[PDB]
Amino acid sequence: GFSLYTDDTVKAAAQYAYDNYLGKPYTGSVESAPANFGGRMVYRQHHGLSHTLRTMAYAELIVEEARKAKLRGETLGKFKDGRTIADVTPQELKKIMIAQAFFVAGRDDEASDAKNYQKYHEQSRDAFLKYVKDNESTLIPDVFKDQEDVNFYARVIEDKSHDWESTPAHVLINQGHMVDLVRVKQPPESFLQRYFSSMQRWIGSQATEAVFGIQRQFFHATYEVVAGFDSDNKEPHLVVSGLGRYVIGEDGQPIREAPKKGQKEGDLKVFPQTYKNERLMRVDEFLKLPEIQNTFPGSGKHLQGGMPGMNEMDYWNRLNSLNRARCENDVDFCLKQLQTAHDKAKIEPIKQAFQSSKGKERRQPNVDEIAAARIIQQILANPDCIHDDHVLINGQKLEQQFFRDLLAKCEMAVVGSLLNDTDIGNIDTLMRHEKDTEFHSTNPEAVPVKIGEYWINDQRINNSSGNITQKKHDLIFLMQNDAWYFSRVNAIAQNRDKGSTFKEVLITTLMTPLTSKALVDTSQAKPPTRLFRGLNLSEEFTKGLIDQANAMIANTTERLFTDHSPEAFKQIKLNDLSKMSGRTNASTTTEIKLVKETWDSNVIFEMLDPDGLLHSKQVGRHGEGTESEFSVYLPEDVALVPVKVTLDGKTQKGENRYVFTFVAVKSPDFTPRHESGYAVEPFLRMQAAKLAEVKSSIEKAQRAPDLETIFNLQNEVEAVQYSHLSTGYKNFLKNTVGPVLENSLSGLMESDTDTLSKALAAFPSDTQWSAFNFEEARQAKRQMDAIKQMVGNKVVLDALTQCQDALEKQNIAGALDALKKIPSEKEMGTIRRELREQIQSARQELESLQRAVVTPVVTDEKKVRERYDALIENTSKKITELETGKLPNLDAVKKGISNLSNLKQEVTVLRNEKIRMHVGTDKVDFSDVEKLEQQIQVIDTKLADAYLLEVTKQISALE
């Protein structure tokens, strides 16, 4: 529970140091000049408040990354006793920091000369001793153990001896002190290699890269310069161990001296004053050395100094501003800055682990969700189709599993966006049709209640108006008030229910999108930044959660040079806790008091929602004294990734309370893979049947083909040539009507083809017939109309049949194409208002074609690919390392087996990734993971026989 940025005791100490020593003008002589930043005065710009505070922050950081390192399978550097930096306790750490405040408070001048050094450290340890002595009554009982302790740390501040690495405290304070020199010492590449190598001995490589990475952010947060790192830097390499140089002479080779058994031996350190044809060794030469190329991650790498996003002029402007001065003056401010920096550096790497997201808004619906919403609406509209174990619509039976699938795959908030106030209203019709029983999930020794009756009586007693808005609020109320309802609902939605009824499953499937819709409509309150969730969990399960969360925290680190992202990725895919909050309208609160005291929960989920992802909606009134509850349907691409797990107090029942703080991260790497067609296909069958009845009805109602009619009108066309009627009418029947009859006859006689569809279009309009006065033109026209319908019925029939043939093969587009074919009124119009049904189905498919298929591999094909390669090299390296595993005893076999298990899961991660980045239509290529899996098999059996052998030897030794 302890931290620098929160503990007021540490802050008190630092404030003291500022008030009495650090904020006081330099009582020195050389380079004791005061500094002016932005027109505000700071007396110690090199060793002021920002310095010491940053060093305490370094202590926090290095301890954190050390513990992360130990949480990974790593083995940190042991001291005299078996302790590592990752064994530093919060109280010990507090002592270390309180000491660290005064470490530079005993300074007068800036001089570096040894006597001034001893003197200033004398004054420093004295300052510390004074401060401790004064507040002895508060510290000595609980902060410290005894004056022995404070003497230890004071002795560390004194540094009379030149020892720096005897204990954790020593390393932390001294290294934490000197590493702050990165911002001022150049060349950078020289120092950074030195400090890095010095920290790697104790904490490890990755944790060190994390340290210096976050350190850059600490410099940015306190407005000090950020050193660049140039691998091609051609300034002279400064040997930082003492002040010295590396010299190459004659043949472009450095000065060396052979020993006893080195072959070529250690570079000779030539002091910065050398009279030498010989030449100095540059930075890049130093980095390219074979010694520094397998030990230093920065070899070949580059770090852009300054601020990314601005030019060095206005960056310089940022360096010389009021915030620099306030940083060196205001304590609470400096601590806040560093706090936000660090807390940020806990979030950004997680984002780096996964491919980026463009915008925060909710997704758009796909085919399956459109079909889902249509179905749901038809259920709400016609409750007549609801039965005991299935729902029948248009000859299609919909089991329990269908609705469970709907609950599992469909973004129910998105599906909710496609429901309307009519569907909200139809809740009444659903409940009037219903008198079925809903049960508490838990508490089987608890009352059941008829849900339909309850809802109806509730709406009648409260919303007598029938006001639809009030209906929405009432749905949300039913959600947040009555456990007999939301227990069953939230159990069924998350596939962790048992012995539930079909009625209950169905009702849940229907109520989820409606509830989310009601929420989206109702809530006009701004999306909160911090949400809390209470949980009552067994001791062991809580333990498992702590382990998983720790796995996810331990493997994500800020980047310096080497990219440790694919590992963070893999671990987060391996241990993700997000699905505990998904698939349903989760209930949360913005007040901690609710989950901590009232409900007394042993596990608390703290959800940080800064980017306003995770669109939460207010529930209920929200005044002083309310639950301040909010509802969240977790977007499928958003994950709640742990930033920290903390041990807080105990419950009222005694068990320890754990609070895990999560951070919402949106990425297409979180969208689950779902084979489409789970909802849209039965919907297409529904439409196929609905059209089938129409085609049958039309086929039977209307007359079939008589073609004497055609023949007779053609004969009459030839006959009117001798009629005395007109030139116009003769030419009209001969030239215009004649060929139309020709094509109609041809098409009707064989098949169809477009010839039919085109012929029907060739039919002269009623206006054309009207231009022929009034005569026998009418008598020819009614014949022509008889024929027109003769062909109309045929075209509609064939269009329907073709469309239906298209539906069967699931081609949703071709169906539209055919249906387009229907003549519509005029041309056809011999068909009764079952045109309604037809144009309605046309509309259903028009709507189903508005589907937005959302990409699983955005822009970062490169990031996804590179990440996969890194992942599979890492995993294969682990496996092949376990291939040559020497197993001499039983413990080794244990570790080998657990290893084998973890690898087994890693390989499946590899597999899923292979799936989700395969674009196109072909069998997925698994060739690389086949070999891996085979290796897994071999080194599984090997481990098995090794195990039974070793336990044999054990029980043998026992006798």
Binding site: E708, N715, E716, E718, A719, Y722, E776
Partner: protein
């Protein structure tokens, strides 16, 4: 033997006539005279795009039972 055939008009009336082969066209026009009061002098009879002259018999045109004929009024001429 005996057979019935149909004559149609642009006006839209259908007349059913009873005839045998070996009746001339002018004879058919006479039967139409009795049927619908149309003078044989103002009648044209058409069958499959062809005009029927008065002198030929039904057999020469291959007119058969249940066939259809098209009658047109050629006024201003005999």
């Amino acid at each position: 033997s005996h057979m019935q055939i149909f004559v149609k008009t642009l006006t839209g009336k259908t007349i059913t006539l009873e005839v045998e082969p070996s009746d001339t066209i002018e004879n058919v026009k006479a039967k139409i005279q009795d049927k619908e009061g149309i003078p044989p002098d103002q009648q044209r009879l058409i069958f499959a795009g062809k005009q029927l002259e008065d002198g030929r018999t039904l057999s020469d045109y291959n007119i058969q039972k249940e066939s259809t004929l098209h009658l047109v009024l050629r006024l201003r001429g005999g």
